[PDB]
């Protein structure tokens, strides 16, 4: 039951890899879908 965890070496984390490429959230994409009933705003954003 050591529960040695530890910081580890590389310490890259989730964020660092993508910041290295420089995607800065271009690679992750949230799709936008239109609806038959939609606010004009929702159309605008589209």
Partner 1 sequence: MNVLTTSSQRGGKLFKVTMTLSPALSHHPWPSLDTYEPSQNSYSVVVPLDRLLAEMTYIKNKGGRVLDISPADLEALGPPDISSVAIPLKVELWAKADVSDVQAAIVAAYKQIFGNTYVLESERLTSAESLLRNGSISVREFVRLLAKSELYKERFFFCTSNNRFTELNFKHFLGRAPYNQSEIAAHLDRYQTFGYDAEIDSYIDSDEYIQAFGENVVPYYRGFKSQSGQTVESFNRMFKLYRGDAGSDTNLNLQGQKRRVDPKNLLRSGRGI
Q: How far is CA 16 from CA 2, 27, 36, in A?
A: 29, 14, 40
Query: Is residue 25 part of the contact set for partner 1 (CB under 8 A)?
Result: no
28 counts as binding partner 1 under rule CB under 8 A = no
Selected from 27, 32, 41, 46, the binder of partner 1 by CB under 8 A is 32
Residues that bind partner 1 (rule: CB under 8 A) add up to a total of 7
Does residue 35 bind partner 1 (CB under 8 A)? yes
> Using CB under 8 A as the criterion, which residues of the chain lie in contact with partner 1 when the complex forms?
30-33, 35-37
């Amino acid at each position: 039951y050591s529960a040695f965890v530890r910081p580890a070496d590389q310490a890259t984390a989730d964020g660092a890899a993508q910041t290295k490429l420089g995607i800065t959230a271009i690679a992750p994409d949230q799709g936008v879908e239109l609806r038959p009933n939609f606010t004009e705003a929702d159309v605008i954003t589209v």
